[PDB]
């Protein structure tokens, strides 16, 4: 299970 | 705040449109929404930086976005269903982050009748103004098409939002090509009505950069009460 969604820079 | 022009727009089958949205300073993310009532809302495209990582949400090819801070949205070949309110919002940077929404841009398909409104200001009762004691002021705008008519209340040139009232839904005269009608009221104290000018001015969005062609163009028309 990946993290559902990440950030960006 | 946010800016999103044109406030409204009416044009026909088989032409282009440019939809502006200007996010607030420093916003970096933008969302494009359209809403078909009564379908519900669903999402079209999100922009970050200067890049469109996802496309496969806006339905077809005529739709295509450009980011120019500010950006535009283009659909060549305006056709039948592409007939909704198009909304634009911005959160700094980040998707989950709090979105702030633009004014809104209506758009209606068609080819063709279209015309500006009536504006007729009624005046209230002999005895009612002494009944309350109460004062009251009415307005009424009909015989127009299509919806993209927003009301402006003016008095001494400076607007008023205190007591005013506009109706939310327009009135189809019938029932599917028939045209519209609206009615805004007001209440003002009564000593107040003894030699001022209470403006019911009404904005109709026609076409004032001429398109194909009783005119009828962006106009303000206004009926006045004493």
């Amino acid at each position: 299970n990946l993290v559902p969604m990440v950030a960006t820079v | 705040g946010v800016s999103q022009s044109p406030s409204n727009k009416v044009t026909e089958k088989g032409k282009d449109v440019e939809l502006r949205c200007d996010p607030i300073s420093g916003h970096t993310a933008l969302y494009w929404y359209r809403q078909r009532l009564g379908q519900g809302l669903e999402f079209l495209i999100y922009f970050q930086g200067n890049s469109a990582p996802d496309k496969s949400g806006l339905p077809s090819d005529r739709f295509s976005a450009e980011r120019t801070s500010v950006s535009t949205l283009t659909i060549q070949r305006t056709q039948q269903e592409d007939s909704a309110v198009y909304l634009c919002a911005s959160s700094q940077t980040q998707l989950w982050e709090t979105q702030y929404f633009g004014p809104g841009t209506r758009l209606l398909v068609l080819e063709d009748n279209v015309f500006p409104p009536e504006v007729a200001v009624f005046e209230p009762s002999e005895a009612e103004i002494s009944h309350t004691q109460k004062a009251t002021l009415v307005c009424l705008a009909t015989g127009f098409y299509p919806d993209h008519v927003e009301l402006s209340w003016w008095v001494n040139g400076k607007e008023v939002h205190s007591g005013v009232c506009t109706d939310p839904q327009p009135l189809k005269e019938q029932p599917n090509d028939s045209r519209y009608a609206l009615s805004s009221r007001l209440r003002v104290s009564a000593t107040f009505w003894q030699r001022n000018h209470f403006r019911c001015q009404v904005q109709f969005y026609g076409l004032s950069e001429n398109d194909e062609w009783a005119k009828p163009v962006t106009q303000i028309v206004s009926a006045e009460a004493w």
Binding site: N1, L2, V3, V6, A7, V9 | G49, N50, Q94, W96
Partner: protein, 274 residues
């Protein structure tokens, strides 16, 4: 102790289209998933036998997010290439690694999330799980972005939360491959360079996990330095190897030893010749 971890890499590809993005997922020392921007599948293919039995909803679920990643990476490259005032045809890399590890009690012990651009460090999540480290000034704002987007939080709740919650799910299911300990296969060979000298060679094959320490003694002394040690390397079955060797004046061979210590062995194995 045990851990489940995702490595991310997206390589910019100028004038020839979408940046290649490779996502690969590891639990402990083995590889259980993969995604590739140039994959036939365009979806998350299982790499380890035990995870294939996972639901049809799972692979759809996972695929959906790993896409979201490569989207965001396709974003990151761009929104970095303008921070650093750099060209369009530079073909840069971005790296993200994240994941959680657990004790023998089997619960949260460590959380990692780290991020580097075009090689050297960029930004890393402090183990505080509440603060950040900025390698650059460019980073220090990305810090300030996340510092306000409350980014520390979501990740934390993921790592303390569903990262672990699923890590056990994986282990219990992949009890077979993950929880094992296959003690290394020990071997030794002699290969001469002359009559003047000779080269003793210490082999450790077919071991899991990969973290192994194998040392090499002369009469009891650790001949630290005339010895050569090579990055523990992989093989099939997903098992590992390592190789160490020295110069040995001819005849003085039986003086030299070899100690192979590993989690699969109760006490170090002394390898001789012979």
């Amino acid at each position: 102790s045990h851990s489940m971890r995702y490595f991310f890499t997206s390589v910019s590809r100028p004038g020839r289209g979408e940046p290649r993005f490779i996502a690969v997922g590891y639990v402990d020392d083995t590889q259980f998933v993969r995604f590739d921007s140039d994959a036939a599948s365009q979806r998350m293919e299982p790499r380890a036998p035990w995870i294939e039995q996972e639901g049809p909803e799972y692979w759809d679920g996972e695929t959906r997010k790993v896409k979201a990643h490569s989207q965001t990476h396709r974003v990151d490259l761009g929104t970095l290439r303008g921070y650093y005032n750099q060209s369009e045809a530079g073909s840069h890399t971005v790296q993200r690694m994240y994941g959680c590890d657990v004790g023998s009690d089997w619960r949260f012990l460590r959380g990692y999330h780290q991020y580097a651009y075009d090689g050297k460090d960029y930004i890393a999540l402090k183990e505080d799980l509440r603060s950040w480290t900025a390698a650059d000034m460019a980073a220090q704002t990305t810090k300030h972005k996340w510092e306000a987007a409350h980014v520390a939080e979501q990740l934390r709740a993921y790592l303390e939360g569903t990262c672990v919650e699923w890590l056990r799910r994986y282990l219990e299911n992949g009890k077979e491959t993950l929880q094992r300990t296959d003690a290394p296969k020990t071997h030794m060979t002699h290969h001469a360079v002359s009559d003047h000298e000779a080269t003793l060679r210490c082999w450790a094959l077919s071991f899991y996990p990969a973290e192994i320490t194998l040392t090499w003694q002369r009469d009891g002394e650790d001949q630290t330095q005339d010895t050569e040690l090579v990055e523990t390397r992989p093989a099939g079955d997903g098992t590992f190897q390592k190789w160490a060797a020295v110069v040995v004046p001819s005849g003085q061979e039986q003086r030299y030893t070899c100690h192979v210590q590993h989690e699969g062995l109760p006490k170090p194995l002394t390898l001789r010749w012979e």
